[PDB]
From Swiss-Prot:
The cysteine framework is I (CC-C-C). Alpha4/3 pattern. Its main location: secreted. This is Alpha-conotoxin ImI. Coiled coil: none annotated. Changing P6R: Loss of ability to compete with alpha-bungarotoxin. Belongs to the conotoxin A superfamily. This toxin is a substrate for a multienzyme complex that regulates its folding and assembly. This complex is composed of protein-disulfide isomerase (PDI), peptidyl-prolyl cis-trans isomerase (PPI) and immunoglobulin-binding protein (BiP). PDI catalyzes the oxidation and reduction of disulfide bonds. Oxidative folding rates are further increased in the presence of PPI with the maximum effect observed in the presence of both enzymes. In contrast, BiP is only observed to assist folding in the presence of microsomes, suggesting that additional cofactors are involved. Negative results: does not inhibit alpha-2-beta-2, alpha-4-beta-2, alpha-2-beta-4, alpha-3-beta-4, and alpha-4-beta-4 subunits. Also has no effect on muscle nAChRs alpha-1-beta-1-delta-epsilon. Expressed by the venom duct. It is found in: Secreted. The record marks D5, P6, R7, A9, W10 as: Important for binding to human alpha-7 nAChR. Changing D5L: Reduction of toxicity. Not hydroxylated. Hydroxylation improves its folding but impairs its activity against target receptors. Alpha-conotoxins act on postsynaptic membranes, they bind to the nicotinic acetylcholine receptors (nAChR) and thus inhibit them. This toxin blocks neuronal alpha-3-beta-2/CHRNA3-CHRNB2 (human and rat), alpha-7/CHRNA7 (human and rat), and alpha-3-beta-4/CHRNA3-CHRNB4 (human) nAChRs. Acts voltage-independently. Competes with alpha-bungarotoxin for binding to the receptor. Binds to a different site than alpha-conotoxin ImII. Is highly active against the neuromuscular receptor in frog. Also exhibits inhibition of D.melanogaster alpha-7 nAChRs.
Length: 12
């Protein structure tokens, strides 16, 4: 998942 990565979760 995207929300799995911090580089994405940053905006989750």
């Amino acid at each position: 998942g995207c929300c799995s990565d911090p580089r994405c979760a940053w905006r989750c």
